[PDB]
Amino acid sequence: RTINLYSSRHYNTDDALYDAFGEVNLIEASAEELIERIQSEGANSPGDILFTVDAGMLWRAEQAGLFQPVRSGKLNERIPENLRHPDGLWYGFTQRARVLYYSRDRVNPADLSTYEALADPQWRGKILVRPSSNVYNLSLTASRIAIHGEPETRRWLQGLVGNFARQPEGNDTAQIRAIAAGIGDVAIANSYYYIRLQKSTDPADQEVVEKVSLFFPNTGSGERGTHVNVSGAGVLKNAPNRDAAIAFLEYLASDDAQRYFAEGNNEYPVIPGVPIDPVLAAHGQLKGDPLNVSNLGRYQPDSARLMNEVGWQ
Amino acid sequence: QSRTINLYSSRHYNTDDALYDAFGEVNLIEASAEELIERIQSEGANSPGDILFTVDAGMLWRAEQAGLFQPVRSGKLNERIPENLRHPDGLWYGFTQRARVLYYSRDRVNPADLSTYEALADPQWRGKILVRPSSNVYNLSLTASRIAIHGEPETRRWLQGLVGNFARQPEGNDTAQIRAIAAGIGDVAIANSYYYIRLQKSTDPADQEVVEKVSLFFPNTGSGERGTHVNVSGAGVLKNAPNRDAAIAFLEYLASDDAQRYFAEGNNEYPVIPGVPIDPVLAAHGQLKGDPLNVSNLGRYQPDSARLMNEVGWQ
Amino acid sequence: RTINLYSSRHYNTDDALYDAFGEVNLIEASAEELIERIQSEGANSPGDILFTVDAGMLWRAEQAGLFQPVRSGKLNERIPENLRHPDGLWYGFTQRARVLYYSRDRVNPADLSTYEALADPQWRGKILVRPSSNVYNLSLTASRIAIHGEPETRRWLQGLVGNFARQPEGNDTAQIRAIAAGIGDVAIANSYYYIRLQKSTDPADQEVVEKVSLFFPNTGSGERGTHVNVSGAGVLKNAPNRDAAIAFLEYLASDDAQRYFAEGNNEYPVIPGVPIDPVLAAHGQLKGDPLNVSNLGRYQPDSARLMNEVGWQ
Amino acid sequence: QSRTINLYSSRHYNTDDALYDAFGEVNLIEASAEELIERIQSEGANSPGDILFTVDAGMLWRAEQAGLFQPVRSGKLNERIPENLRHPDGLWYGFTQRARVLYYSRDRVNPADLSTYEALADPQWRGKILVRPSSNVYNLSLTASRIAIHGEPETRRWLQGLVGNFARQPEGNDTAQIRAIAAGIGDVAIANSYYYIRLQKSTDPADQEVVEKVSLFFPNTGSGERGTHVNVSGAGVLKNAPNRDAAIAFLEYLASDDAQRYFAEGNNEYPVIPGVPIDPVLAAHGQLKGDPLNVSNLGRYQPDSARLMNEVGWQ
């Protein structure tokens, strides 16, 4: 089995995982760069699979026409419907949650509930989130548009931005560290960043863990579930090894591969029953929003528009 | 035993460990610039950090604004480091420099039509300009430099024209803009110099295709223009540095010819010291003619830059 | 689950494999260095597990008194008896084969059979093997002493050395490349080195693969099987986390972990039925000698003595 | 475009890539020394290798014996590289040097009792000496140097006494011998200088314990003794080098002060060029006083060394 895999994700157990499959010739760059490279390659791309992170980036690839639909009984049986494209263009293989982090000292978790509630006036001066250009934020806002519509999402964004502790700066972990530094009290950031800190041998990172806690939002009655997003992949339009490409996707969905692929970046498998990293699992069961993740891409342009309209820098 | 310091750096190239070992025992703490600033803030008045090294005068300024640096007075640093590549009050010092240049489609753009950042606001560039999001510090610093030079009203008008000429709403990183030219998405990108050097050095045929399709153009070097926009990576001694003398000694060492040469090589950047050999691939693009603006201006007008870029709709 | 793992083996999927278990604090050095470090640590070693490569090195650790015996129903059920110490002091977790490589152009594989036959006069000037100080060679010779006794092993060594293409020099892959360079015709080296070459993207390494083939010796009637050896581990005498240490050993013997742990260095799992790396598997079924691998250590001193007696440098 | 060469090297420290980039396009092929020699042999008369760089004069000699090198005549190399650290016929050149020194138990050995390699054959060292197996090229080269200096009969007698004093049959690598002293297995080890520097620099408390328990002693520096045994890592231009002029230029570059400093740092070795700063941790052990023996002697008597070591039972 041989394939040319273009991937914006690589951690290093991946190589034993890929070897077990066959020859996987890896091409690596950032997601936007790989999409553009494939675009440049016209009808002659040697790529079989594009693997990237965030349904918002899969949508950018999809928009550029990069994928061919595939029909695999195995992928359909195993991968939850809401974690794959309705037309079979791409499939999620890991998921992450965009959670809340809070100051243990300064925030009672009983006062937390939903993303939507962070627009409430009590959070004035307290909210930490990275810039609006980031695809994780584009996708969270996109999910809110899918759920609530544009007017309601605008009102939420207006409150949320109003409550910023500072103009967005830094990456997701920068928001977590900002709580510990006393700059703000509640941050929105992905789950796996906190697991990194917990696993760190750096005593400074343990200080952050001691001071800041993880809270899963939106798990109460009528709240839908925590926002989830995926890393995943689809078969490229002109894939020279189409059978092998589909076989690779099926392999990535296998119990063995799922377990250690998800471990790579402290993410959750997409396959139920596959063991979850113990440090991640100790935070509790993931109760994800059932929204089809294709909606994260669908409302990406509207999300950028609304976030910029209300002054989220 | 060796000189010792605690170096907090957002820059590391595998290639730097021998540079540091030659100095002494450099205990390296690494994280993104914003994270390091926040870590030091958390550590408070007894932080053991000796030096913060980071990339972009805009990041040094964020550190400065958090009150992280103490001023140092060093004859060697003053004599060697160009005055405009260090803070006027001795709070921090540039050790490498990069240029924010233009990239253009060889097939679709005639470089005679290029000149300055300012001219990219001309209506002929409608639907042609590629640049990454306004959140990025390299952009914040380029705009900050235009404010320093032209004032806010002029700079606002330039931003309006520039944004009006975007080929698409900003997405992806600097190299993504260069690749977007190759892919036919736009025709002129703004990105740093060293990203193109990476592509030239790459063994990947697809990277060589990009360098075949796109060329590097140094803007603002014409008669009566100031010079290309330059920015630095650099460092200062932290306010309550436990190893203050060693920290100053370390800054002096980083300014030495031996260290400058290979420190700059690490990321295909230019040394700040004149006469220190420049990477041959970078040097083949010609002599850097940098704007003499003191790089502290890049941080000084950072808030203004973020405000104006957002006002005009640079996403 | 937390343990202090001293290991002379590390490949980088190991980290996702270890994370799935718990916190595995890794200490790494060469095998002899780790044994000596533990010796220095007296009754105060923080180590829970010593993992090392070659039953000959496990024996050196065992000789230094470093292990405590453990009794695990799971290890006993799953790990073949011949791949673990009879007294439960240590357990193999991967295996390798010490095979023959031959010049495709110059050697007909029909002329190959056993290690023992390489002492035959037809191999004069043709045999390539690394120096006698190497533990892989110590263990192969040790197995011959276990099987044939010392007098017969001496006669074999005398013929074998007589047939050397050159005085031993270089590592195992150096012997493989030496065939391709025309220096000799048959080399003795481990299986996984050739798999490395096959997986290499370097066109020079593919030239070696095109010129040199792998042959499993000793698989005919009455030949016992190919010489095998293991990488494995035991619980340290003063292990501070004994329950966790045993749990880690059991985890290393699990189907999931076995698959990708063996992939790390292109080795075979010790557990039957666990998928084997496809490039390795394409060479055929491994038919290993059933000799208990504790014998490889047991006769190590005699092996060094005999090899040096007959002039194997 | 850049100068280009195909460098086959058995040495690489992450730390070298910036050193090579400063030169030009250095296409690096890496493998163990013996493997590289065999690869080049396989490639035959039209091998594209420009330079073979390897570690130990004994490995350069194996390359020489395979007829892999052409002689080069370079004024800069001749003027800069000490005559005794390069081949008399210009076939290859040392670029770093290491010393094969003694290590001793601080608690159990008084360094006044140490002097020369030769004295370790004295019966007082019975059951005390630690050294790695005779197959190892560092040992082959040390013994080869004694043959060059003393002749075979004297050297044989020295080997007999040395082997008779082994604390255990040789096992493990160089650092294993240093650790074996700490573990109480023996009291005096023979190993290279840079292995101890690694331990000193290590953040692992167990490594610091070894350096607390074991000290480095430079042998053969006494009155009327020749100097400590030194050996080199080094390179020559390959016989049918496609880029011959660039290859020579590359050797000249590796001998420059800038490159020497950090090339030596990579593995805690000494530069071959006098005046080039030495790593501070290494330098704190004192000035290297090397034996002036031409290092080509280390390869010249390699077969003799292997024969005599095996004859006397050094396993």
From Swiss-Prot, chains A, C:
Disruption phenotype: Cells grow normally in the absence of iron; double knockouts of this gene and futA1 (slr1295) grow very poorly in the absence of iron and have a marked reduction in their ability to take up Fe(3+). The keyword Signal applies. Induction: Transcript levels increase when cells are grown in the absence of iron. Periplasmic levels increase when cells are grown in high NaCl or in the absence of iron. Fe cation binds at H10, Y11, Y136, Y192, Y193. One of its GO terms (molecular function) is metal ion binding. Predicted to be exported by the Tat system. The position of the signal peptide cleavage has not been experimentally proven. Keywords: Ion transport, Iron, Iron transport, Membrane, Metal-binding, Periplasm, Signal, Thylakoid, Transport. It is found in: Cellular thylakoid membrane; Periplasm. InterPro entries: Ferric-bd, SBP, TAT_signal. GO terms for cellular component: outer membrane-bounded periplasmic space; plasma membrane-derived thylakoid membrane. This is Iron uptake protein A2.
